[PDB]
Amino acid sequence: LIVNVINGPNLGRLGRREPAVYGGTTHDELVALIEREAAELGLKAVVRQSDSEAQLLDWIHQAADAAEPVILNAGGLTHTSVALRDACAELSAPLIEVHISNVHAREEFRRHSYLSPIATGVIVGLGIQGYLLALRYLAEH
Template sequence: MADPTVMVLNGPNLNMLGKREPAIYGATTLADVERMLADAAKPLGLAVDCRQSNHEGELVTWCQQARETHAGLIINAGAYTHTSLALRDAVTAAELPLIEVHLSNIYARESFRHHSYLSPIAAGVICGLGVQGYVLALQAMAEIVKAHVA
């Protein structure tokens, strides 16, 4: 039997990770993060399906598709965290456990970043720990998935 797969979605501008505002977001690229997650998934008994889009509709479609094929969602929705009811509705409809990730501490930044449409429906939120937050989210998701299938 194949390992359960967790979909890791990254929203707008995360393709610029390592280049955009490295003082805030660090020098690690999104490709580096995806390799880290693939390496971390194996010993946890998981597989990862990493995707990034600057387009809200594409993220919504992927959440809808994940309902049938994935065991959980890890999402760094970028700016859509603070604006997208459509993404929230798609995550809710997916009926999968969600962990929300942010590289920076959104609560130590501009006030408009303090609100998340995803946090109220997430099993957990990790912010301010840089790229390590993704690995921590995957570790937490492994426990959630194990509990769900047990």
């Protein structure tokens, strides 16, 4: 029972870098927390990260083809990519948009998401735990 967790640009540097903004949990550690949560919930999680929009697009395409759910933290592309929104709008299974930081407590431009209108829902500002909460929503359909 497969859920894709997909992280966009720069997020490979979590924890190690920008800890005051995005937390101390590294990308490897987050993969381990997601896999733990997934197991408890009876799901298989697949965690991917890329700085390449083309790569991200390809993973979304695969998830639309497999009709699998997607938890997506698109990084800066959240606020800028129509191409990413159009790939995501193809998904039939739920799409949960996640932001680690509270985008509403930062610069104004971070308060607009291209993904939110086509997502099932959005979790913002709850740190790493956002991913884990999103998983639990998907376990409940």
